[PDB]
Design a protein around this ligand. Structure first.
Ligand code: RTL
Length: 134
């Protein structure tokens, strides 16, 4: 019961500000990012899955190779570089980053027509709820 191939827009954020603080994002970026709420458009195609991000500010596409490893340069976010992998624990999805800090390792869980998840970073939890647009 997982089908990413669709359209998902962000509704709100309860810790997008606090999460920006973990990576020590500028005061300007935090300001701009507040009004911003990128819309993700996933395109599943086998073992290759691309997660779009179109905020009309700066395009940051990634190539999530399910089960396989790939680097991930976070330059544009908070200027970072690491190695990320993704697994399928079960009904949920779980991505682990072999970087620094203590938290960097995403987790997900879909619950219908709203792509919910639990972002983690440096011990901080960021709940960002995305809704299907269909
Ligand atoms: C702060 C900030 C941004 C947030 C970027 C992030 C954090 C994207 C998330 C990537 C992940 C974690 C993907 C795993 O599926 C963007 C550039 C987009 C817009 C303005 C500045």
């Amino acid at each position: 019961p997982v089908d990413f191939n669709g359209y998902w827009k962000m509704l709100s954020n309860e810790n997008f500000e606090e999460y920006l603080r973990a990576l020590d994002v500028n005061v300007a970026l935090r300001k701009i990012a507040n009004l911003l709420k990128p819309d993700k458009e996933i395109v599943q195609d086998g073992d290759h899955m691309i997660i779009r991000t179109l905020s009309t500010f700066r395009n940051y596409i990634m190539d999530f190779q399910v089960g396989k490893e790939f680097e991930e340069d976070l330059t544009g976010i908070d200027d970072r570089k690491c190695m990320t992998t993704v697994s399928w624990d079960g009904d949920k999805l779980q991505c682990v980053q072999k970087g620094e800090k203590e938290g960097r390792g995403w987790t997900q869980w879909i619950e219908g027509d709203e792509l919910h998840l639990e972002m983690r970073a440096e011990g901080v939890t960021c709940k960002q709820v995305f809704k299907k647009v269909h």
